[PDB]
């Protein structure tokens, strides 16, 4: 499970926003600058930016 270091503020409804402390399961994208993770709360999708999170 990855951890959101910086609060990611999404501008659209597609990618969900997460504050500092929310965890998300990484789906794919090992590099680049935009990965997709699935929150473990409501069980929805949340394109998390490669930046703003870190494996921990």
């Amino acid at each position: 499970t990855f951890v959101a270091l910086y609060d990611y503020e999404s501008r659209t409804e597609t990618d969900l926003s997460f504050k500092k402390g929310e965890r998300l399961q990484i789906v794919n994208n090992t590099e680049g600058d935009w990965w997709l993770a699935h929150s473990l709360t409501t069980g929805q999708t949340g394109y998390i930016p490669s930046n703003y999170v870190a494996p921990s």
């Binding site: 910086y6 501008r11 600058d33 935009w34 930016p49 930046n51 703003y52």
Partner: peptide
């Protein structure tokens, strides 16, 4: 510091 602003995908 200076969080990397969303690089437009």
């Amino acid at each position: 510091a200076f969080a990397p602003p969303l690089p437009r995908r």
